[PDB]
Amino acid sequence: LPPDLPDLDPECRELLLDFANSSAELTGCLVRSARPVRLCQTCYPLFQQVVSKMDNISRSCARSLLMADRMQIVVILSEFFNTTWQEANCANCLTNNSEELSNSTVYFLNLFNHTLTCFEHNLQYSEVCKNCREAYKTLSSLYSEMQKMNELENKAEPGTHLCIDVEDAMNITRKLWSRTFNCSVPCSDTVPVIAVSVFILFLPVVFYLSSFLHSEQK
Amino acid sequence: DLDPECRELLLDFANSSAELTGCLVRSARPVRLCQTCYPLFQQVVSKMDNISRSCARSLLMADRMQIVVILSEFFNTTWQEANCANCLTNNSEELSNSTVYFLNLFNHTLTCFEHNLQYSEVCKNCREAYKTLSSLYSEMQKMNELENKAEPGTHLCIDVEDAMNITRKLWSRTFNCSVPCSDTVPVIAVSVFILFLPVVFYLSSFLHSEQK
Numbered sequence: 001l002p003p004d005l006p007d008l009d010p011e012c013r014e015l016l017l018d019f020a021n022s023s024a025e026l027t028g029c030l031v032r033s034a035r036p037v038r039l040c041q042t043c044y045p046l047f048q049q050v051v052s053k054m055d056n057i058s059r060s061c062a063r064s065l066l067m068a069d070r071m072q073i074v075v076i077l078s079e080f081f082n083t084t085w086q087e088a089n090c091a092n093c094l095t096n097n098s099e100e101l102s103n104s105t106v107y108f109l110n111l112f113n114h115t116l117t118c119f120e121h122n123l124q125y126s127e128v129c130k131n132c133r134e135a136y137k138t139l140s141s142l143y144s145e146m147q148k149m150n151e152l153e154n155k156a157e158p159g160t161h162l163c164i165d166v167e168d169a170m171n172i173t174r175k176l177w178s179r180t181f182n183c184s185v186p187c188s189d190t191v192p193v194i195a196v197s198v199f200i201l202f203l204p205v206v207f208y209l210s211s212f213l214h215s216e217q218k
Numbered sequence: 219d220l221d222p223e224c225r226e227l228l229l230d231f232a233n234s235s236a237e238l239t240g241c242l243v244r245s246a247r248p249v250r251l252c253q254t255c256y257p258l259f260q261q262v263v264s265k266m267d268n269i270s271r272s273c274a275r276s277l278l279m280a281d282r283m284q285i286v287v288i289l290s291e292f293f294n295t296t297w298q299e300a301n302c303a304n305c306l307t308n309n310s311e312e313l314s315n316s317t318v319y320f321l322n323l324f325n326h327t328l329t330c331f332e333h334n335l336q337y338s339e340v341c342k343n344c345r346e347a348y349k350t351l352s353s354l355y356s357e358m359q360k361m362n363e364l365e366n367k368a369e370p371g372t373h374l375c376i377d378v379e380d381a382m383n384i385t386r387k388l389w390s391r392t393f394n395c396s397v398p399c400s401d402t403v404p405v406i407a408v409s410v411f412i413l414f415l416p417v418v419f420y421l422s423s424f425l426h427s428e429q430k
């Protein structure tokens with residue numbers, strides 16, 4: 001029988017098996033890094049391996065592996081892995097296989113680890129709020145730097161997200177600071193707001209009544 | 219981080235999704251998807267439900283990129299569009315009897331395709347074996363669209379669909395044993411005669427009116 005239809009080619013079986021264990025490893029690493037999200041900072045080597053192994057297949061086995069069937073496992077699985085990378089925006093915080101993005105990401109994760117070191121020994125949620133308050137603001141200021149940088153260095157679209165483990169690290173500590181520790185203290189200027197608002201809202205009452213009364217008098 | 223009892227519902231789902239993805243690939247070129255790791259897909263679906271049964275908050279919607287949700291959606295979409303439900307029974311712990319019958323027929327059909335290589339003998343020795351396999355496949359095409367009430371005949375189990383396409387391409391394309399009967403001369407004669415009728419009708423109508 002021809003070594004294409006009923007069975008795999010000798011050089012196509014190994015290529016498919018090589019891509020098989022690479023895709024299995026990436027999928028296992030994706031789940032283990034789902035919570036807390038350490039996706040782009042842990043799965044970046046395995047994702048590159050999968051993409052490279054896709055290229056070797058799609059170079060002498062492309063016909064027998066890529067579009068040989070109605071359902072294309074290798075195409076959809078690699079497309080799914082690509083979509084996961086793009087949606088996670090792991091291109092950010094990864095400058096051509098480099099861990100950082102102009103050292104911004106390692107600095108953020110170093111700051112995030114430093115910031116989270118406060119929230120452990122400052123409990124025994126009172127002493128955390130004022131002791132290293134600037135540590136949270138230092139991290140929070142840096143995060144806003146990347147948002148504007150992401151619209152200048154990258155310039156994809158206003159509102160584009162950064163790489164997910166950076167974005168998740170902000171939310172881990174934002175919810176750990178303004179929600180569990182209640183260290184957020186807005187001033188809540190209320191009585192002057194009420195006095196000013198009722199004064200402005202009372203102006204149309206004067207204007208319409210005075211206009212009506214003045215016309216009636218004359 | 220998560221509590222240790224929460225890094226048990228994600229670690230077991232991790233190795234379950236890893237081995238399912240490993241099988242999805244190594245069972246792709248000769249498509250044996252729905253028949254090799256139908257239990258691995260069931261394990262993933264069950265272990266996903268275990269999470270939603272005390273870690274749903276901490277794992278499912280805890281962040282923007284819901285990895286477990288999209289991974290399970292991808293596995294579900296792969297199973298659904300591959301129509302692997304047709305391959306196994308309704309209770310779905312073993313292959314259907316009809317599907318099991320097709321697979322051994324496919325092995326039986328492919329047996330002569332190798333036996334009769336040493337393609338004149340192939341087209342004669344078990345030509346009926348190809349037709350009984352082809353008839354059975356068409357039988358499931360209509361049976362499938364009545365079982366699940368699908369209006370068109372679109373997609374069977376990908377193992378069955380690929381097995382037939384392997385045989386069809388091995389029979390009508392490489393062994394070219396499919397020889398349709400053509401009568402070009404009788405077709406030309408009748409088609410020319412019919413196409414010549416409007417010529418007579420329009421000319422006779424024109425000539426009849428010209429004559430007074």
Ligand SMILES: CC(C)CCC[C@@H](C)[C@H]1CC[C@H]2[C@@H]3CC=C4C[C@@H](OC(=O)CCC(=O)O)CC[C@]4(C)[C@H]3CC[C@]12C
Binds near residue numbers: 190193198205
């Ligand atoms: C005199 C006529 C023509 C206008 C009347 C206007 C009132 C119907 C409005 C104007 C300002 C409003 C107030 C503006 C702000 C607040 C605070 C709000 O809740 C808070 O205390 C929030 C405090 C915070 O967010 O820090 C409750 C409603 C109240 C009293 C509002 C009640 C309705 C008020 C008095």
Ligand SMILES: CC(C)CCC[C@@H](C)[C@H]1CC[C@H]2[C@@H]3CC=C4C[C@@H](OC(=O)CCC(=O)O)CC[C@]4(C)[C@H]3CC[C@]12C
Binds near residue numbers: 204205208209212
């Ligand atoms: C929910 C609200 C705050 C949205 C904004 C709408 C109001 C601020 C506006 C809508 C119509 C306005 C009113 C339109 C007409 C008049 C009549 C005017 O006096 C009269 O009744 C004159 C005629 C008469 O004397 O019978 C006094 C102002 C008043 C109530 C206006 C006050 C301001 C009003 C309530």
Ligand SMILES: CC(C)CCC[C@@H](C)[C@H]1CC[C@H]2[C@@H]3CC=C4C[C@@H](OC(=O)CCC(=O)O)CC[C@]4(C)[C@H]3CC[C@]12C
Binds near residue numbers: 400402405406410
């Ligand atoms: C008398 C006037 C008014 C009409 C003349 C019509 C012709 C121009 C047509 C009618 C039938 C046609 C034929 C019908 C079928 C065929 C077979 C066809 O051969 C195949 O492709 C056979 C193999 C296959 O089926 O793939 C080649 C064209 C031919 C000769 C056609 C050529 C053009 C023909 C002669």
Ligand SMILES: CC(C)CCC[C@@H](C)[C@H]1CC[C@H]2[C@@H]3CC=C4C[C@@H](OC(=O)CCC(=O)O)CC[C@]4(C)[C@H]3CC[C@]12C
Binds near residue numbers: 416417
């Ligand atoms: C076969 C497919 C590709 C085309 C289908 C259309 C033809 C079969 C039809 C279209 C117009 C028809 C023609 C319309 C009018 C005439 C004129 C008629 O008489 C004349 O030639 C004299 C008319 C005059 O002197 O006014 C003869 C048939 C003919 C050619 C008809 C023959 C059949 C034709 C070509």
